Design a protein around this ligand. Sequence first.
Ligand code: HEM
Length: 371
Amino acid sequence: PLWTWSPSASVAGTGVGVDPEYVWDEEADPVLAAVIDRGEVPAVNALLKQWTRNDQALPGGLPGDLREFMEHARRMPSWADKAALDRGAQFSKTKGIYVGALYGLGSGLMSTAIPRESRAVYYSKGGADMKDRIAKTARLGYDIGDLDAYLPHGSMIVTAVKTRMVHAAVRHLLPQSPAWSQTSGGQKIPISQADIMVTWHSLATFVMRKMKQWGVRVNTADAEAYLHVWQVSAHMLGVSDEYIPATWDAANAQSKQVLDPILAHTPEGEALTEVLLGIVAELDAGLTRPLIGAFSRYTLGGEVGDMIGLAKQPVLERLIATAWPLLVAFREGLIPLPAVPAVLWTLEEALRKFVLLFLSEGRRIAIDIPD
Ligand code: HEM
């Protein structure tokens, strides 16, 4: 379901296509199911913990099927462009407060309105703790934008391959949780490529849309660079090129059809929201529940905020909406200091500390195959 078009708008650009709802990860899935079934997860995790850098040889002692899978998965696509990648990274850094806010509060809360992500995350067993699991898209979205992401001394190739490996492992594990099977609707196997592309629109497409709507200065070169970083990242995550949009016009159209209609409240999503709100409110950021609620509602809009169960705070939301664009125009250098209500500056400081504490200098545990 979800997806109804051909891939002529895609990175691969071809006329034909298989429905991404019924494609998973043909190279990773059986390699990980074997690694899990031979009881090699503890050992593979101790070995992979040593592999932290894009240019590093794989550690010896890996099982042969896994080594082969990994040396192939760490390859950059031939269409990756170094100059665009460096530019997309610079852009992400220069707009760091906006992109960090939008990933951590916008995309991270929107995830709790995406039923399959919420159920998979909620029921997933043996992986990261709940505290880390809930942050996982935002912190990966964040690290995607790093200056070094795809350079030899960076780590995003590492992060993407291990992430791809984790998704493969979950395809073999989640179906054995009766709780996930019973609530899955008709889906036999979790995390379709279609599902991955839903999350992608909740990240890349959403963030670009909101930055342009708020008046962040996004010239055409930067916008395409940011897209490219995201296209290379979808590929490195294991999304086939036939599903990755080629241009912003394609990404925007695909998001209206693939993301918008699947947003929905679930009990599992409700539970995830409370965890995320509690962790964010517990950071030493000054980001209280009222401020998170109002800003997340302004960002996501009222229909998504209602599904999520963020309560409408009409005064605070109106103050934000009337004045946040002035603050943005001021930080972008376009207007003199604006007379805005003082609480906007409070909000802005709370957001900056949030990016700092939750993402920038945040917790980065090693990405482990689940048990
Ligand atoms: C561009 C899309 C996505 C990104 C960037 C992403 C990122 C990540 C990362 C970084 C992890 C590792 C955290 C960890 O387990 O240590 C992970 C694990 C996982 N992801 Fe995703 N993911 C995406 C899509 C999906 C989708 C669509 C689903 C489900 C429908 C999903 C479900 C999970 C699950 C269940 C785990 C294991 C959670 C655990 O640790 O217990 N992800 N993801």
